């Protein structure tokens, strides 16, 4: 039988230990826990609740993490599952593994589940000419009906996650199954980075005698996970010189440490 998690552990993070992406920090809320908590106010108008969603973007950008604080703030039952274990040696182990999880949800409902990655088991064609790659499609079809077949549940729906958002069927990507899609781009806009650096930085030791705008405006094409590395590495620009609290030039010594690898790969002999 598949598993479930309460308070043996948690991810041990928070909405406050994260920042930015704030418009995504509310679209997610109204789908999931507010319906679970605040029910009547929209049952004043009784429309069917929105339900589980998708969320994509380039690798990183918190595509996998944002769950973790809301997970900490769930007040319902919840899981720890990804995609590429549904497969099994035998044939019917797969689909049999997965029919019951909704029963497990329904046996413990109201609750919700999650997947960290799905693109392995979701593609456009439900390819045909091999005894193997149909048995994955059966794992796709079964949820595709258990999601929004007859009489599914009260719950919100299987929360996706990917690095890509075109490979997979529209039959799954349409209302009643994925009523919201979400992008997580970074873009290096200056409205937010001036926080989330500080968010990541305020939690950690920091010398109030130091530059900080030495790089923000200086760099404009950035992502969200790497940036921890520079102000991770900034500390490591210190202890190598057995310094116990950081200094201003650590970041400048770090600025090109993580990023500056612009372009040298066969420049002249690229195309011409």
């Amino acid at each position: 039988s598949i598993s479930v998690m309460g308070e043996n552990e948690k991810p041990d993070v928070t909405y406050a230990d994260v920042g930015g992406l704030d418009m995504q920090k509310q679209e997610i809320r109204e789908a999931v826990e507010l319906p679970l908590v605040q029910a009547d106010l929209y049952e004043q108008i009784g429309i069917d609740p929105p339900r589980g969603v998708l969320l994509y973007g380039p690798p990183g950008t918190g595509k996998t993490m944002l769950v973790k604080a809301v997970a900490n703030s769930t007040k319902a039952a919840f899981i720890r599952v990804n995609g590429s274990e549904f497969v099994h040696k035998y044939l019917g182990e797969g689909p049999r593994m997965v029919r019951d999880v909704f029963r497990l949800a329904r046996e413990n409902a109201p609750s919700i589940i999650f997947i960290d990655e799905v693109d392995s088991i979701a593609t456009k064609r439900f390819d045909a000419q091999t005894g193997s790659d149909r048995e994955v499609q059966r794992i796709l079809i079964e949820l595709l009906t258990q999601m929004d077949g007859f009489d599914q549940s009260t719950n919100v729906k299987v929360i996706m996650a990917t690095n890509r958002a075109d490979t997979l069927d529209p039959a799954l990507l349409r209302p009643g199954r994925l009523d919201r899609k979400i992008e997580f781009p970074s873009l290096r806009d200056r409205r937010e980075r001036r926080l989330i650096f500080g968010t990541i930085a305020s939690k950690m030791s920091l010398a109030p005698e130091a530059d900080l705008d030495s790089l923000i405006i200086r760099n404009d094409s950035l992502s969200g996970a790497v940036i921890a590395a520079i102000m991770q590495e900034a500390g490591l620009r210190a202890v190598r010189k057995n310094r116990y609290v950081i200094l201003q030039s650590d970041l400048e010594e770090a600025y090109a440490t993580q990023v500056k690898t612009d372009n040298t790969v066969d420049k002249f002999d690229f195309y011409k």
């Binding site: 612009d262 420049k267 002249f268 195309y271 011409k272």
Partner: protein, 250 residues
């Protein structure tokens, strides 16, 4: 000797989309950025070179090039497959139109014959297409100022304000907002200029860039003064300080 009249590119894949064409313009998008737009009274084209190493001179390699005193063009794609066909192109304007009539050609049909340089190559035996999708700007009297894009197939479109290359889509997404139906020149070049600067890092030095226009005649350059039936060359590019003083404005 050369036993390979076997027609390359003549194999329609079953979907109906050709093979190398959709691969050829896979290059030009991987190529550098350019653009060129239009106004009521003048025209402009520009791009940037990316020397890629310091010591190499960056004024001999003229990416923009002349083909008539009233027409001028640029690309952004592959280089060496550009400078060969202009030499055919400008030769045509002497041959197909001038020697037989006397005049220089309009641009409703120079582009047509430049296209015919191209499709005769994607259809004969063992010949790749030219990895360029250039664009020309010219002036006439039945139609005056005008603009044209081409593509390595041969399909020429007309246009009003366009970019092609690396981040052209971002620029085509950019122009049309702050574009205007009567953006005359000295603001056109500005919006044109900044239309590139977003598309670039490294350095935006005045020497980094070339550009040019087709405006009004300038018989200070015509040299052979003493003939009222010899108008001025309507085409003329610009140097690297008169660009670099519209640039100090921003």
């Amino acid at each position: 000797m050369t036993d390979r009249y076997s027609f390359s590119l003549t194999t329609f894949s079953p979907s109906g989309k050709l093979g190398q064409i959709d691969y050829a313009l896979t290059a030009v998008k991987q190529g550098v950025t350019s653009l060129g737009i239009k106004a009521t009274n003048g025209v402009v084209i520009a791009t940037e070179k990316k020397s890629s190493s310091p010591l190499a001179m960056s004024e001999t390699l003229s990416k923009v090039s002349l083909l008539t005193p009233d027409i001028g063009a640029v690309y952004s794609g592959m280089g060496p497959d550009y400078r060969v066909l202009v030499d055919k192109s400008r030769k045509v304007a002497h041959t197909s139109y001038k020697r037989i009539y006397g005049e220089y050609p309009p641009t409703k049909l120079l582009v047509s014959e430049v296209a015919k340089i191209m499709q005769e190559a994607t259809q004969s035996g063992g010949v790749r297409p030219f990895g360029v999708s250039l664009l020309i700007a010219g002036h006439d009297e039945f139609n005056g100022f005008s603009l044209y894009q081409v593509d390595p197939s041969g399909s020429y479109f007309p246009w009003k304000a366009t970019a092609i290359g690396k981040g052209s889509v971002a620029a085509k997404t950019f122009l049309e907002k702050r574009w205007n139906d009567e953006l005359e020149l000295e603001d056109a070049i500005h919006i044109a200029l900044l239309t590139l600067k977003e598309s670039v890092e490294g350095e935006f030095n005045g020497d980094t860039i070339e550009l040019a226009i087709i405006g009004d005649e300038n018989p200070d350059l015509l040299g052979y003064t003493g003939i009222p039936t010899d108008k001025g060359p309507r085409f003329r590019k610009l140097t690297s300080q008169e660009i670099n003083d519209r640039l100090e404005a921003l």
